[PDB]
């Protein structure tokens, strides 16, 4: 059937989204999105839904598997996998006119829904406890 | 050094017939693994030989490399009372490869 598989990434977290044709099943690691444990960030994954309207997800079901990163870093990876999966499905099984419409609303609200953040942790350098921080100097 | 005559002999039929000897630098080692005697005996017995110009000694990475001089084959020819048919092993004229 009509199946597309995509992925979103944050610092280390990576969420692999599978978007198949169906009744509209949207699960996080086999669990409904209505029960994400970062409760204060539950609307971060609700943003790709309410921006376009839930009617777009009638015909597609989404199952993601998010691993790596941390609690917050996984949420941004998940919301990116969902947003990219919806676009990739439209480009392949729907006219590209609709795909360009959906891509417009997401980008006009938040770039990170479709574009992965390129920031990674700076390496630590000797002479300090951090990337730029240095040991306290004495005279 | 006080080496028994018998243990010193085995040191000589190892430095002749395989005219090179390798000894790890540990004085209390029970067995030099190729001459059934104390490791310290091998170092000090061959320290005399290099002291009297019969073996070259080279030291690298805590290891002794003893090689037999041409003058030392004649010395073991007579002192060991061996036949004057010597050719220990490194002198058997195997000839090099080009």
């Amino acid at each position: 059937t009509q199946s597309v598989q995509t992925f979103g990434k944050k610092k280390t977290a990576t969420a692999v989204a599978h978007v198949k044709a169906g009744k509209g099943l949207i699960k996080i690691n086999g669990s409904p999105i209505t029960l994400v444990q970062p409760e204060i960030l539950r609307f971060k994954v609700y943003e790709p839904l309410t921006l376009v309207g839930l009617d777009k997800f009638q015909g597609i079901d989404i199952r993601v598997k998010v691993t790596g990163g941390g609690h917050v870093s996984q949420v941004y990876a998940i919301r990116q996998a969902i947003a990219k999966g919806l676009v990739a499905y439209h480009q392949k099984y729907v006219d590209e006119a609709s795909k360009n419409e959906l891509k417009k609303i997401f980008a006009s609200y938040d770039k990170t829904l479709l574009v992965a953040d390129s920031r990674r942790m700076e390496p630590k350098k000797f002479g300090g406890r951090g990337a730029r921080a240095r040991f306290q100097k004495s005279y | 050094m006080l080496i028994p005559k018998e243990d010193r002999k085995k040191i000589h039929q190892y430095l002749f017939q395989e005219g090179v000897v390798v000894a790890k630098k540990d004085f209390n080692q029970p067995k030099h693994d190729e001459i059934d005697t104390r490791n310290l005996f091998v170092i000090k017995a061959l320290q005399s030989l290099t002291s009297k110009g019969y073996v070259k000694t080279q030291f690298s990475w805590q290891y002794y490399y003893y090689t037999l001089t041409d003058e030392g084959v004649e010395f073991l020819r007579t002192e060991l009372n061996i036949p004057e048919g010597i050719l220990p092993l490194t002198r058997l004229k195997n000839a090099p490869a080009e």
Binding site: - | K25, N28, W61, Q62
Partner: protein, 55 residues
């Protein structure tokens, strides 16, 4: 008698239990990957062993 006393103390699981391959030192030994080399002897042999500075 004397042989039971000379070098009788155990010399295992200690810093004196091991020594540098090169200089037979006891301080600053490197045991990773079974190098068993002093940190000073390692620097003068690192290129030969196959360790290079990249980053």
């Amino acid at each position: 008698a004397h042989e039971n006393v000379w070098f009788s103390h155990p010399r295992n699981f200690g810093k004196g239990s091991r020594q540098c391959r090169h200089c037979s030192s006891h301080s600053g030994l490197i045991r990773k990957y079974g190098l068993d080399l002093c940190r000073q002897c390692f620097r003068e042999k690192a290129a030969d062993i196959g360790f290079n500075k990249y980053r």
